[PDB]
Design a protein around this nucleic acid. Sequence first.
DNA 1: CGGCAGTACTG
DNA 2: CAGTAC
DNA 3: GCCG
Length: 318
Amino acid sequence: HNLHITEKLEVLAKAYSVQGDKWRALGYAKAINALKSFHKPVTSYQEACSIPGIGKRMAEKIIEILESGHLRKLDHISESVPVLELFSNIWGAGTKTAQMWYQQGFRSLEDIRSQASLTTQQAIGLKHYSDFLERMPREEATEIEQTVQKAAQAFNSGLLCVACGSYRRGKATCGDVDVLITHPDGRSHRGIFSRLLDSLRQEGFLTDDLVKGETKYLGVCRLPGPGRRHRRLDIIVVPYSEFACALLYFTGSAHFNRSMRALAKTKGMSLSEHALSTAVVNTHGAKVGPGRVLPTPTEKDVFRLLGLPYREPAERDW
DNA sequence: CGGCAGTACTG
DNA sequence: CAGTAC
DNA sequence: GCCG
Ligand SMILES: Nc1ccn([C@H]2C[C@H](O)[C@@H](COP(=O)(O)OP(=O)(O)OP(=O)(O)O)O2)c(=O)n1
Ligand SMILES: [Ca+2]
Ligand code: NA
Ligand code: NA
C-alpha cells in the first residue's frame, strides 16, 4: 500500500475540509483514495504526474515525501484545526459555524454548552455528540428497519420499507439508518408521515426531530432496554416510479454516487435520487430545456442506460 | 475558465 | 437568502 | 486539489 504519502496528505485534506475549502479537499480526497488502492507503491514523479487524480502540484508534493520523508506544508497548519473539527462534528454545525465560534473565543464543547447560541438542531447534535460519532452493529440497523416497517405496515400493509446506505451495502457497522418507503400502487405513499411518526413517537422510539419535511424525516431514535444508544434515523418517502433511482442514491456510497453522476454527464445525462434524465442543455446545465426522464424500473436499468455492468450494493462501497 | 449535483429544510 | 445535510 |  501507499501509507507514507497518504498519511501526510490526509492531514492536509482534513485541515482544508474543516476550514471550508471544500473543493481543494475533494481533489486531495480523490488523489489520496487513488493512492490507497493502487497496486504498486509509487516510486517517483512521472509515475505520479501520470496518475489519475495526481497533477503537477500533487506530484511535487509526492516527491517531497519520497525525497525527504517530510512535507513542509505540514508546518503551516493552523492551530485552529483540531477545534474546528471538534465543533463541526456537532450535527447541524458546519465549517461556517465552527469558524465563528472559534473567532468568538470558544475552544471546547464546555464553552459551547455554556455560552454558545445553538439552533434547535445543533442542541440535539451536541446532546448526542458521542453517540453520533459511534457506529452501530448492522444487527441494530436491522432492528431499527423492522421498527419502521412494523409501524408503517400497520397503516398500509402495501408499504415497502428498505434500509439503504451502508446497511444495504452489507457493512458490519452503520453510522446511521436510512429507511426508504414506497408503495407499488403509485400513490398511497402520500401523507403517511403524520401517522407514521406519531406512531413511532408514541413508542418512545423517536426521541428527537431534526428535519420534518414533506417527503423526508431526519431524526433520532433509541431502541428499548439497557445498553442502548441514540441513533440517527432518516425516513424518505418516494413515489414508486422513482424507487430505482432512490434506492441507488440512498444506497451510495457517496463516492460511488459522485462517480455515477460524472459518468452520466459524459453521456449527456443527469442522475439524481429522482431520475436518470437527459441533460437540461456550457457546463452546469443551461437556462431552458427541461430534459427527458428515461425509464428506470430497476437499479439494473440505470446501469444499463449508462452502458455499465450492474453492481450489487456490496460492490458500490467506494 | 470553471465544474467537481440538485434538492430539501431551517430560520 | 446562507448554511447544512443528504 | 483534480480535470477538460
Ligand atoms: N454527501 C452525500 C451524503 C450522502 N449521499 C448518499 C449516499 C449515501 O450512502 C446515502 C446515505 O447517507 P450516509 O451519510 O448515511 O451514507 P452511508 O450510510 O454510506 O455512511 P456510512 O459510511 O457512515 O455508513 O446518501 C450522497 O450521495 N452524498
Ligand atoms: Ca447511513
Ligand atoms: Na456537523
Ligand atoms: Na444517513
